[PDB]
Write a structure and sequence with these properties.
part of a larger assembly, 4 chains, A: 123 residues, mainly beta, two-stranded antiparallel sheet, 20% strand, C: 107 residues, Chitinase A, domain 3, 5-stranded antiparallel sheet, FKBP-type_PPIase (chain C), Peptidyl-prolyl cis-trans isomerase FKBP1B (chain C)
């Protein structure tokens, strides 16, 4: 439940972290609802909060969990990498560039199927 | 908020058996080329537009399935992060169209020839259609796996492959640095056309079901590679004189004689008299090839010991008849190994040595700046055996094997035993 | 806001003139890509007269900007069609439309 | 992310005719009969 001190929140606790067949491998948590970026780009006070288009969510890594083995961020639906040896080098990323007939470039777009950070890059 | 229904078309994907990838130990080129000529496309057979794209794809990631999938459906080349598509006027990658600026841009009409410029050194894919290049390229993609050409088509499409001059005929000249695509065929398998990751295969009796295909890995193309005891130090030149005498018997059996020059067309052998009659670079070569195959013989775990030097010395040479003596009249006398029979443990160990020796040789050849092709281009650094040993065909695999079977039983005829 | 990007070129010389009929084997989408309409599913070459404003403004302005047998991709802006309210039940308010047409015959 | 899931085979497939024609024309491939299906969308996940 969400309190006056705490937002509405949901956790993930391991059942069998002791003995008797404690299974552990790198699991991937996605939420259930997407956010949608607007069709065209732009190119508290009640004024600013009713006009703002920028949003915040939050995770908190508990004690006893290493941020070295925690990855937090964003994922688009066409992502199906299920591996236990995942590091940030193992992320698909394709850079598309286009130019004129002169060869001078016009744009350099990078599509990735994953937009995350490393928690080990802060602690 | 609700569900939507629609009729859509089926897509498939086809490829040749041309899996090019790069790594640290790279026996491959890394810059290729091929052409596709389209000659018969109905634009609208169905209610939906006739799907037809051409590009490149990875092995381990691109898995097109005949229904469903990512997007609205009919997903094929460029429909995720594992392949990169072109249709005539869009760059398909990551399931999004990208509008291009091509001169005279249109779809893949009939009587059109498209080309795919590929680079593995820099991550780069380019295209030209009917000789005319496109104004857009791909960059910075991953390199964990191999690459093969893909064309995804809907129904109502007839198209032909232009792979290389032995199979197709290139309607345009490749840009300099781009090998014709019929060169990366492996020696074990001929060129063939196939679908990808399939499960149904229509059989005689009726529709066969197959399991998952076993893909060649990324690093299946990199080859692989101490002190020496004094009891093997003296026998090293003994087998070296045995090897040259066995070579000159092999030379004289086909028609090489002892000549001052080395002419194979005239059948001349300057090492046809004796091992001491071999020149000092060949005399040093016979010893350094002896020390290499012995330091690796202990390295695999085969224990060696010295015993029965009397019965080894009591074994005479192989009998050389008047037909065995060459035109010089000096027939070499190698050590007789008719008494020694090789074990299946030794028949296992004789393959592991020739696997190492061939792959450590190509390791020196890969350091020499050489890469594989099916054709043999010596100034263009192509040797048709520049693969690891299990990728080598059986003929050259047997050829180094019968080469190394000579040194085993003569060293067993020298009294030395081999543990497994 | 009538952007015509070609898909396949036609005759290049034959254009529809006013007071005349056309036959278009069209189909449309939205910017999300959801296919709200077609014509081939109904198996009927859709016909209309130019100039008399039977179709929306972004359609017939795209129509005379084509050649006979050409295949074009149109992009009709919100202000040119179904601007404030949109169609009831089908097209939402302030929606940009994306078309795929083909002039079959008759200028 | 579960690793596998049960899907359904279709009842017909594309009839593909692959054949190399000529040592200079190369390898030909064609198909003529069309085969279609119905598809749901689940628009929140874009997975048909």
């Amino acid at each position: 439940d969400g309190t006056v001190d705490t937002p509405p929140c949901l956790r993930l606790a391991h059942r069998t972290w002791g003995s008797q067949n404690s299974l552990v491998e790198m699991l991937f948590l996605r939420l259930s609802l997407p956010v949608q970026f607007h069709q065209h780009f732009r190119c508290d006070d009640p004024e600013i909060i009713l006009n703002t288009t920028t949003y915040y969510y939050s995770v908190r890594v508990f004690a006893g969990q290493e941020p070295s083995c925690v990855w937090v961020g964003w994922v688009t639906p066409d992502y199906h990498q299920h591996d236990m040896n995942f590091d940030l080098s193992k992320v698909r990323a394709v850079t598309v560039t286009m130019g004129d007939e002169q060869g001078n470039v016009h744009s350099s777009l990078k599509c990735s199927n994953c937009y995350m950070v490393w928690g080990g890059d802060f602690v | 908020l609700l569900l939507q229904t629609n009729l859509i078309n089926y897509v498939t994907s086809i490829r040749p058996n041309i899996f090019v990838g790069r790594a640290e130990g790279s026996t491959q080129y890394g810059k290729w080329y091929f052409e596709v000529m389209v000659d018969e496309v109905v634009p609208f057979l169905t209610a939906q537009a006739t799907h037809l794209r051409v590009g490149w794809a990875l092995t381990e990631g691109y898995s097109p399935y005949p229904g469903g999938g990512e997007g609205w459906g009919g997903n094929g080349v460029g429909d995720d992060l594992y392949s990169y598509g072109f249709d005539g006027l869009h760059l398909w990658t990551g399931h999004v169209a990208r509008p291009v600026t091509s001169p005279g841009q249109h779809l893949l009409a009939p009587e059109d020839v498209v080309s795919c410029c590929l680079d593995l050194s820099v991550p780069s894919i380019s295209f030209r259609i009917n000789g005319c290049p496109v104004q857009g390229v791909f960059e910075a993609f991953n390199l964990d796996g191999l690459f093969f050409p893909v064309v995804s088509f809907s129904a109502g499409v007839k198209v032909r492959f232009l792979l290389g001059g032995r199979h197709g005929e290139f309607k345009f000249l490749p840009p300099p640095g781009y090998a014709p695509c019929h060169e990366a065929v492996l020696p074990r398998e001929r060129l063939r056309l196939e679908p990808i990751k399939e499960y149904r295969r229509e059989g005689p009796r009726g529709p066969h079901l197959v399991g998952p295909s076993r893909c060649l890995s990324h690093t299946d193309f990199v080859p692989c590679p101490i002190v020496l005891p004094p009891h093997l130090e003296r026998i090293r030149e003994k087998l070296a004189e045995n090897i040259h005498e066995l070579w000159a018997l092999t030379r004289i059996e086909q028609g090489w004689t002892y000549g001052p020059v080395r002419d194979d067309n005239k059948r001349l052998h300057p090492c046809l008299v004796n091992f001491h009659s071999l020149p000092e670079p060949e005399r040093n070569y016979n010893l350094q090839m002896s020390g290499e195959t012995l330091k690796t013989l202990l390295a695999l775990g085969c224990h060696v010991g010295m015993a029965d030097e009397k019965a080894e010395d009591n074994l005479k040479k192989t009998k050389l008849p008047k037909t065995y003596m060459m035109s010089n009249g000096y027939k070499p006398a190698p050590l007789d190994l008719s008494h020694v029979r090789l074990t299946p443990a030794q028949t296992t160990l004789v393959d592991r040595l020739a696997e190492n020796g061939h792959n450590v040789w190509a390791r020196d050849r890969v350091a020499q700046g050489w890469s594989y092709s099916a054709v043999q281009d010596i100034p263009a650094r192509r040797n048709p055996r520049l693969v690891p040993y299990r990728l080598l065909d059986e003929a050259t695999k047997r050829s180094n094997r019968d080469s190394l079977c000579q040194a085993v039983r003569t060293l067993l005829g020298y009294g030395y035993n081999i543990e497994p | 806001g009538v952007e015509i990007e070609t898909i396949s070129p036609g005759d290049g010389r034959t254009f529809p003139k006013k007071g005349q009929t056309c036959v278009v084997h069209y189909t449309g989408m939205l910017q999300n890509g959801k296919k709200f309409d077609s014509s081939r599913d109904r198996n009927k070459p859709f016909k209309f007269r130019i100039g008399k404003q039977e179709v929306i403004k972004g359609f017939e302005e795209g129509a005379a900007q084509m050649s006979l047998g050409q295949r074009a991709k149109l992009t009709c802006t919100p202000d040119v069609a179904y601007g404030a309210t949109g169609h009831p039940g089908v097209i939402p308010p302030n929606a940009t439309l994306i078309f795929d047409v083909e002039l079959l015959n008759l200028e | 992310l579960m690793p596998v899931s049960w899907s359904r085979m279709p009842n017909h497939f594309l009839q593909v005719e692959t054949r190399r024609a000529g040592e200079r024309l190369g390898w030909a491939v064609q198909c003529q009969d069309p085969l279609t299906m119905m598809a749901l969308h689940i628009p929140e996940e874009n997975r048909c």
